[PDB]
Amino acid sequence: RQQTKVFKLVSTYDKVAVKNAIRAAYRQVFERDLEPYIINSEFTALESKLSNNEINVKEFIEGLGTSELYMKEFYAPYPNTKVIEMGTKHFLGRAPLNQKEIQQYNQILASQGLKAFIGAMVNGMEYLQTFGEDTVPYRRFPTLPAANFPNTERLYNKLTKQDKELVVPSFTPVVKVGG
Amino acid sequence: MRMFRITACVPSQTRIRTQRELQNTYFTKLVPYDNWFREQQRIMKMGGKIVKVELATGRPGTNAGLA
Amino acid sequence: MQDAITAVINSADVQGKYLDGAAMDKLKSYFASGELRVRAASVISANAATIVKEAVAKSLLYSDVTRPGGNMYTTRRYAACIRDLDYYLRYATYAMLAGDASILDERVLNGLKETYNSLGVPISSTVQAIQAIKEVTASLVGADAGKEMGVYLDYICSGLS
Amino acid sequence: MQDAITAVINSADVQGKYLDGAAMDKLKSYFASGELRVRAASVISANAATIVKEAVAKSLLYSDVTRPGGNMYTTRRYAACIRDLDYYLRYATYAMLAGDASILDERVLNGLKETYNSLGVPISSTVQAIQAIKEVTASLVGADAGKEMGVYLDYICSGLS
Amino acid sequence: MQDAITAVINSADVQGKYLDGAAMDKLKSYFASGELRVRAASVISANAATIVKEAVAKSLLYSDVTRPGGNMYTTRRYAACIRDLDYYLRYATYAMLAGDASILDERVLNGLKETYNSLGVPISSTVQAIQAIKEVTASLVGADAGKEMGVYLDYICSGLS
Amino acid sequence: SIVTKSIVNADAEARYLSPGELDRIKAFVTGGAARLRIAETLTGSRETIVKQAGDRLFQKRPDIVSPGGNAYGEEMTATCLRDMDYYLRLVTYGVVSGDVTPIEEIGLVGVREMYRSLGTPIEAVAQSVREMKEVASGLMSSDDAAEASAYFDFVIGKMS
Amino acid sequence: SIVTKSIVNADAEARYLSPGELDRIKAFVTGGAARLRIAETLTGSRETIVKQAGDRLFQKRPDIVSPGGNAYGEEMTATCLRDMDYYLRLVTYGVVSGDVTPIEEIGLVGVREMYRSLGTPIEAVAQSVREMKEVASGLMSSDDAAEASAYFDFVIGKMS
Amino acid sequence: SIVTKSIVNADAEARYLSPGELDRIKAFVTGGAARLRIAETLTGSRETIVKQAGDRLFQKRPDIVSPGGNAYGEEMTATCLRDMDYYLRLVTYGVVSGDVTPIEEIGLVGVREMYRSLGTPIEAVAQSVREMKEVASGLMSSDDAAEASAYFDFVIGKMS
Amino acid sequence: AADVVPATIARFSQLNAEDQLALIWFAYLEMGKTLTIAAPGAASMQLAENALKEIQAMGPLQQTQAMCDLANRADTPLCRTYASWSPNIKLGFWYRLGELMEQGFVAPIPAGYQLSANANAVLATIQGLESGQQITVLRNAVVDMGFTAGKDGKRIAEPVVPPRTKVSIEGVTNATVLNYMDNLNANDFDTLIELFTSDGALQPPFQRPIVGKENVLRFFREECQNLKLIPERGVTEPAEDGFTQIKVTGKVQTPWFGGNVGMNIAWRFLLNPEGKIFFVAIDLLASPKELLNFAR
Amino acid sequence: KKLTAGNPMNFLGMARSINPAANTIPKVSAQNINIEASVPRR
Amino acid sequence: RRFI
Ligand SMILES: *[C@H](C)[C@H]1/C(=C/c2[nH]c(/C=C3N=C(/C=C4\NC(=O)C(CC)=C4C)C(C)=C\3CCC(=O)O)c(CCC(=O)O)c2C)NC(=O)[C@@H]1C
Ligand SMILES: *[C@H](C)[C@H]1/C(=C/c2[nH]c(/C=C3N=C(/C=C4\NC(=O)C(CC)=C4C)C(C)=C\3CCC(=O)O)c(CCC(=O)O)c2C)NC(=O)[C@@H]1C
Ligand SMILES: *[C@H](C)[C@H]1/C(=C/c2[nH]c(/C=C3N=C(/C=C4\NC(=O)C(CC)=C4C)C(C)=C\3CCC(=O)O)c(CCC(=O)O)c2C)NC(=O)[C@@H]1C
Numbered sequence A: 001r002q003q004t005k006v007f008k009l010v011s012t013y014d015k016v017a018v019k020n021a022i023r024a025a026y027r028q029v030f031e032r033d034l035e036p037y038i039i040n041s042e043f044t045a046l047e048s049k050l051s052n053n054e055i056n057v058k059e060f061i062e063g064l065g066t067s068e069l070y071m072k073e074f075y076a077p078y079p080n081t082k083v084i085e086m087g088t089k090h091f092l093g094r095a096p097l098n099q100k101e102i103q104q105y106n107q108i109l110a111s112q113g114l115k116a117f118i119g120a121m122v123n124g125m126e127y128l129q130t131f132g133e134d135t136v137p138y139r140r141f142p143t144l145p146a147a148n149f150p151n152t153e154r155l156y157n158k159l160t161k162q163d164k165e166l167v168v169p170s171f172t173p174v175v176k177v178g179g
Numbered sequence B: 001m002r003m004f005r006i007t008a009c010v011p012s013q014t015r016i017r018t019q020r021e022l023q024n025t026y027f028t029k030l031v032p033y034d035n036w037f038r039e040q041q042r043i044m045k046m047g048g049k050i051v052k053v054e055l056a057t058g059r060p061g062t063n064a065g066l067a
Numbered sequence C, D, E: 001m002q003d004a005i006t007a008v009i010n011s012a013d014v015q016g017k018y019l020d021g022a023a024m025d026k027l028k029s030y031f032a033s034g035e036l037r038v039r040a041a042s043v044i045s046a047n048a049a050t051i052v053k054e055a056v057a058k059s060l061l062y063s064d065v066t067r068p069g070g071n072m073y074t075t076r077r078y079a080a081c082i083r084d085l086d087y088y089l090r091y092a093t094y095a096m097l098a099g100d101a102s103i104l105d106e107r108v109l110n111g112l113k114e115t116y117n118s119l120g121v122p123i124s125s126t127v128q129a130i131q132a133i134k135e136v137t138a139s140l141v142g143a144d145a146g147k148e149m150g151v152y153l154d155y156i157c158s159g160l161s
Numbered sequence F, G, H: 001s002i003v004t005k006s007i008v009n010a011d012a013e014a015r016y017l018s019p020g021e022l023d024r025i026k027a028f029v030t031g032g033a034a035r036l037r038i039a040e041t042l043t044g045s046r047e048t049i050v051k052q053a054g055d056r057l058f059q060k061r062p063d064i065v066s067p068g069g070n071a072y073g074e075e076m077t078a079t080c081l082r083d084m085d086y087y088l089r090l091v092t093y094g095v096v097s098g099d100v101t102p103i104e105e106i107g108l109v110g111v112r113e114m115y116r117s118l119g120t121p122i123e124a125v126a127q128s129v130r131e132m133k134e135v136a137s138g139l140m141s142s143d144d145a146a147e148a149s150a151y152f153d154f155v156i157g158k159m160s
Numbered sequence I: 001a002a003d004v005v006p007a008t009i010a011r012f013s014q015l016n017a018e019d020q021l022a023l024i025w026f027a028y029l030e031m032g033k034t035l036t037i038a039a040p041g042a043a044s045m046q047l048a049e050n051a052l053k054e055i056q057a058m059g060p061l062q063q064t065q066a067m068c069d070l071a072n073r074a075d076t077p078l079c080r081t082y083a084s085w086s087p088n089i090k091l092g093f094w095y096r097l098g099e100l101m102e103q104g105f106v107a108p109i110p111a112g113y114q115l116s117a118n119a120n121a122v123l124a125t126i127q128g129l130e131s132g133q134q135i136t137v138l139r140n141a142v143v144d145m146g147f148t149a150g151k152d153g154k155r156i157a158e159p160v161v162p163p164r165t166k167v168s169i170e171g172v173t174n175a176t177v178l179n180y181m182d183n184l185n186a187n188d189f190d191t192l193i194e195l196f197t198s199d200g201a202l203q204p205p206f207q208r209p210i211v212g213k214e215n216v217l218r219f220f221r222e223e224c225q226n227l228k229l230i231p232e233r234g235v236t237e238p239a240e241d242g243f244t245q246i247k248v249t250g251k252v253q254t255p256w257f258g259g260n261v262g263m264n265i266a267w268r269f270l271l272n273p274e275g276k277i278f279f280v281a282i283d284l285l286a287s288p289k290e291l292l293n294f295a296r
Numbered sequence J: 001k002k003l004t005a006g007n008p009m010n011f012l013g014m015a016r017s018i019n020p021a022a023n024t025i026p027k028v029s030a031q032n033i034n035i036e037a038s039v040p041r042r
Numbered sequence K: 001r002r003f004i
């Protein structure tokens, strides 16, 4: 929680910093450097826009989530339930909060697909309050609400492709409305 | 796709930040058409002032061929 | 956003003075109108979809706006127009409840005029649709509340020019 | 989350039944207890910081947990421990007002054991602290309200054990 | 972006008309050209790396552009210039396949001239490099297919200039 | 419920319930018997509220009970009155709770999906609830009707 | 069109059209004449197709043109038929372009919202297109019908 | 006030105010008369409230008005009384609006940074507000003082 | 080239204000027999609910004037409110008035009125149309009524006509009751009160007895406006202390306390041995009409 | 089986007692409608 | 449509 770096792109004059922010963005969203699973880079124009200050880090981050590469890595191999928790991990830094959030993103996936889901997370108020427009998302250590810390911990203590299991398949309800 | 180029000045309300913040305070950015309504609402709720909006990409009045 | 109370507070605070008799009167007047505003707000929320349905049928349907070549032609743009009106009515209701148009400046008239001019949305037709919303609401909430809702719907109309 | 009232409603809903006389008796019992719950809640909120301070003093301080190498040692961990005790008291107050513990199962206990066991937080020591909070708040709000708050603080402790 | 086909469809929809005789003649024209477009695209695709390499070699290398004080000097600038040329050829191919230049406006020229002027990217040298891509491409796809490609590479040049 | 609603509002801000919230709760518990009487009234006259309102609906919307209508035939007509019974019962839940969440969580979240899947014209459902609001209102004093109307209007405003 | 769709798919990967994207463009352009024929047969008998389709719809849904129905009354039946001609016109757009994008951009994005506001039962609008597909299928050879039906059915599916 | 808080909460969900929120607003405007009474009391007694509070504070904190103290000398001690008057005026704003928001936005965001820059012992500012609370609570009934206490306490709490 | 629907609408526009208004009323009567039924649920009639309350609250004279204003396009707030409504709402609004006219809540067309020669022919044309064509013509007949600021105007206004016997009772001939019933049906409260003692008391339907001349006087001014009560039969006897106890029954041809135009009523007159009334009881007799029933 | 709440059988008697009247068979004809001239103009 |  302390021994980390937060990539906050405060200027675009330093191209080395811009490139460092970009490569951190790839590592955050895709969980590692892209070279061993791309042929050629499909993000070059996106990097050009960020580097030219035409977009912000938030737009770059969403551009990564709506890319074909992201779809291949973290949508096609897994069911929509697991897509949700990997989504919040990569873009919000945490496991899903509650069943309402799982419901909310399950409807988006069921009706509009992957790009709508990414757009919902990154454009939400929580994202802007936490990471804002200029900061690459990063792992969080939420205290509240209940179970968010241990669920986020289980998500971030696994290596990529470590297993094919759901950390948060759904929150067991305490009171079944209607049952 | 159609895209807006928007300028906005978003102030700080509940904190006195010490890092440099100009980049996230007064900025100009490209927003996909399908995100502008939501994005405009978000900036407005954060107290932001939308100072300029332009249709950077696309044409007004298109019925077919939005990409 | 600021309601009628916070507006009176801000007027005194900018001058660094306590709330004097005139400011207390304004607070009293707002308090006394509270029941009427909450009544009108309850009526609008119950009929909000109906209000927009009938305002559109009265001001936009079966006209050049909705025929091919009109900005409201295509289901895509028709729905986009219906959404805008739906947001106008709800925000005019907030403004009426709060007794102050600041929420309209901040959450309606903040970049909206420039977005409309970029996309070619006709302001004239938008203002007429809003005016039709004002007519439809007055038939539902009465005259005293309908006049108040008209004040804030008019604020939006003139905000768009 | 479910309070005393929605517990009545839910029990009727799952059977698809309107509320009958017996169900209205349960709602009346809770309405009669409303004044006691509200008064206790306001006293606890106005004394929350002091309730925890005294609970910590008599249950945690000057022990292994506060000496170097201890879980409460370091200012961050001490501060986190006070914050956790603030949470338990605040959610017990929610539960006491609601007259229903379901909020504790949902917003407190869900994943709590896993959290503490992974961090090395001493479960017995936190249970002793909450029990100290139960004793302290009882001497503030009285036996009847103290025993009502005791149910929901004891509910948390039984969740952790 | 509208290809040639959608340009006709959109032109009819704004009128609310079915595809009339003239509209089908435009579609026929494009359907007849389609074989030439696809073949030329498949040739450019297989030789895009080569096409850019000779374009630069003939146009920019061993000149003051690549020498110290030139705008291609430094490996970062050289890579950026090469990247831009790769974009210009691939998008010209897109526009050539589609039969319309709208894709160039939406995905190439958006802010390009202002970017180049602010950064001091020499327009005249950039135009020569695109002309060089034109001449090399024409020698690979034949005269006629190189005439279409040249229209879209000329479109990019007009946007910059 | 009013208690749950204020608790979730307070928890969302990580704070104890405010004096304003605690005063609203105190008033609600102290006016409890008056609300339960309204709920008792609705419950006891549920047969006539649904029947009369259902009779009015089909007069107002004869198409729904014509060939090709969603409620055509006695059996489909029965399910429509059942649905009206569902929504009346929910209104009584809202009355005694002083909050709409029991109504929302049981019968308004996803209602558009449910009725579009069934082919039911949802706005006619809004009309059926509207009809129940008049019949119910005419069985009680104006002040009691106003308290129940708020919850009728919430259902109407959501489906419509 | 099929061309724009291919280009968008390729530009999403910052790469040139793959062999398959090129094959289908080549196949589509060679087939341009057959698509233009179907578009012409549909355009020629549009008046016949809609009016025959409308009568079949009414025999399926007599409620919509009876008191209380959305299309009740001469002017409303005429508007309903007007809408059937809209969606026939868009089906010809789909056929020639080889893509359902023109159909979505003009007449299926937000259609559910538009008809909600107007009170039209959208499933009956789906049935109307199901009728036009049947009537149109009889005016063309089986193969001209198989390609035309695909774009009708896309409208049917999107309106459920 | 609770009006803005309700609207802001309603606008986050792009919804109308629910019946419960409207009822809370109605109760708030009814209690407006009592809120105004308290604020008038504090405003009318402001000069005596600050003067006595200052005397009480200085006896408890002679260091601040001693040589080297931030408020040392007539000019500095008068400025310190002015700050106490500022926060009394803010507490009046909180009273009439029924919420601490005007207090937070005018006088508690960044308050530590400002006073630390001026060399003002923040705990002595917190003590002054405690003194004003004591004096003020003696000029009004138990209920009115309890009402006003929340705003006095809020200032103290944010100054710890 | 039939084009019946617009041609029929053209003929309606030519009828004078009176004929247009008379026509739609007689069209209302045919509804369900030769004309189409109404489906008010297909209109957003909540928009017209407030305007329909104002008309109901009007006096009989004002109500008819209100509807004449609609047909004459006079500039009144009701006509302005009317003009802002949608076509379906307008037609549904007129439908409600026709329903109330039959229910007696709103004043009727002049007694024994006859549809004019031209209007009857236009009606018959409508009668021969299909259902869908009928509603379209009906929609357009009323679409233009009320007041619209622009191109509008009618050649001739159609004012309402400017406009009391003794009531017979079977078995009862007491003058005190006779003056009351005639005075009541005449809305002459200034005279009807003089049949009640200064310490008299009245018992309205579904109410407790009200004791007091001024109270009973006020009640008449409030809940008995334009109210017609017909006694048909009764009986008179002395009961106690010389007081005479008459029980005359009948029917009420006007809505009253949830009653209908055809509800039977009863009076129990209790008047002094030497004259005027000390007490009276009025009780609407329940029957398959149970629309006046509350709950608890 | 004994009927339970929510079962529409519980409301069949109410449905039969209401006995709602269906609309008459419509006689509208698509072939006789001039679409262009009949669509409303506002 | 039958539910039986
Ligand atoms: C090469 C023929 C000439 C040249 C090029 C050059 N360009 C830049 C910088 C940028 N070029 C672009 C252009 C695009 N970005 C995109 O995403 C697309 C759309 C697909 C285009 C056309 C942009 C945005 C920039 C700025 C951001 C970036 O670096 O990517 C440079 C670098 C300038 C600098 O110092 O930063 C250069 C060198 N320069 C020449 O001299 C040639 C004539
Ligand atoms: C219908 C035949 C039965 C039924 C269904 C039911 N499901 C849920 C909730 C969820 N269903 C899913 C399912 C999936 N997510 C995926 O990614 C995949 C792969 C395509 C599947 C199948 C999920 C994740 C949820 C939770 C989120 C959500 O509700 O959107 C419910 C709701 C349960 C509740 O109380 O919340 C229901 C009712 N229920 C029956 O009774 C039928 C037999
Ligand atoms: C002080 C001498 C004067 C003064 C200052 C004042 N500034 C603000 C707000 C902002 N100030 C900045 C400036 C910077 N941010 C940076 O990152 C840097 C670059 C290193 C600079 C120079 C910004 C961006 C803001 C807005 C965002 C923020 O505050 O984080 C205010 C508040 C404005 C308001 O109304 O909110 C004030 C008061 N004001 C005076 O009157 C002095 C003369």
Ligand SMILES: *[C@H](C)[C@H]1/C(=C/c2[nH]c(/C=C3N=C(/C=C4\NC(=O)C(CC)=C4C)C(C)=C\3CCC(=O)O)c(CCC(=O)O)c2C)NC(=O)[C@@H]1C
Residues within 6 Å of the ligand: C060, C061, C062, C063, C066, C067, C072, C073, C074, C075, C078, G064, G069, G070, G071, G072, G076, G077, G079, G080, G081, G083, G084, G086, G106, G107, G118, G120, G121, G122, G124, G125, G128
């Ligand atoms: C007929 C099968 C169904 C039906 C139709 C119906 N529609 C309307 C009114 C409108 N329909 C549209 C539709 C479109 N406009 C567009 O631009 C597009 C894409 C090309 C579409 C699909 C519109 C805009 C209207 C509003 C009127 C206007 O033209 O401005 C009506 C009339 C509703 C009313 O009350 O006015 C009807 C009857 N109704 C049915 O019941 C059938 C299932």
Ligand SMILES: *[C@H](C)[C@H]1/C(=C/c2[nH]c(/C=C3N=C(/C=C4\NC(=O)C(CC)=C4C)C(C)=C\3CCC(=O)O)c(CCC(=O)O)c2C)NC(=O)[C@@H]1C
Residues within 6 Å of the ligand: B033, B034, B036, B037, B040, B041, B060, B061, B062, C065, C070, C071, C072, C077, C078, C080, C081, C082, C084, C085, C087, C088, C107, C108, C109, C112, C115, C119, C121, C122, C125, C126, C129
């Ligand atoms: C309807 C009365 C008229 C009309 C509307 C129309 N608007 C758009 C597009 C947009 N409208 C907005 C509006 C807002 N953004 C805000 O933040 C607020 C405050 C709540 C408002 C009202 C925006 C942002 C857009 C663009 C983004 C989006 O639509 O999602 C369109 C679509 C235009 C197009 O080319 O697609 C239309 C049709 N058009 C008319 O003709 C009516 C008079």
Ligand SMILES: *[C@H](C)[C@H]1/C(=C/c2[nH]c(/C=C3N=C(/C=C4\NC(=O)C(CC)=C4C)C(C)=C\3CCC(=O)O)c(CCC(=O)O)c2C)NC(=O)[C@@H]1C
Residues within 6 Å of the ligand: D060, D061, D062, D063, D066, D067, D072, D073, D074, D075, D078
């Ligand atoms: C001395 C300058 C001031 C002072 C000190 C004081 N402290 C306590 C009690 C405790 N102090 C601590 C401190 C720490 N624990 C940590 O982990 C760290 C960092 C390593 C620190 C600094 C703790 C935990 C306690 C609680 C007792 C315990 O150790 O178990 C007291 C006693 C308070 C009481 O009532 O018990 C005192 C007196 N007091 C002053 O007034 C000086 C300004």
Ligand SMILES: *[C@H](C)[C@H]1/C(=C/c2[nH]c(/C=C3N=C(/C=C4\NC(=O)C(CC)=C4C)C(C)=C\3CCC(=O)O)c(CCC(=O)O)c2C)NC(=O)[C@@H]1C
Residues within 6 Å of the ligand: E060, E061, E062, E063, E066, E072, E073, E074, E075, E078
């Ligand atoms: C020698 C160790 C290897 C080698 C070299 C080689 N280089 C070129 C051509 C170019 N090299 C550069 C390099 C730079 N330009 C810059 O601005 C910077 C930063 C200071 C660098 C490093 C450039 C721009 C060129 C282009 C030619 C030109 O300058 O005009 C060649 C020629 C390639 C050709 O075919 O023309 C060669 C041979 N080649 C080897 O095999 C060695 C390993």
Ligand SMILES: CC1=C(/C=C/C(C)=C/C=C/C(C)=C/C=C/C=C(C)/C=C/C=C(C)/C=C/C2=C(C)C(=O)CCC2(C)C)C(C)(C)CCC1=O
Residues within 6 Å of the ligand: G066, G067, G068, G069, G072, I018, I019, I021, I022, I023, I024, I025, I026, I027, I028, I031, I036, I037, I038, I039, I040, I041, I042, I043, I064, I067, I068, I087, I088, I089, I091, I092, I094, I095, I097, I098, I101, I108, I109, I110, I113, I135, I138, I158, I159, I160, I161
């Ligand atoms: C099916 C369907 C519907 C359609 C519903 C329909 C078809 C509704 C149609 C309802 C109709 C036909 C209403 C006509 C009412 C006429 C009145 C009240 C005239 C009063 C005249 C007076 C007072 C004049 C008196 C006079 C006086 C005073 C004189 O002095 C002398 C002259 C005169 C006698 C004139 C809806 C629209 C609801 C929704 C859609 C839908 O599907």
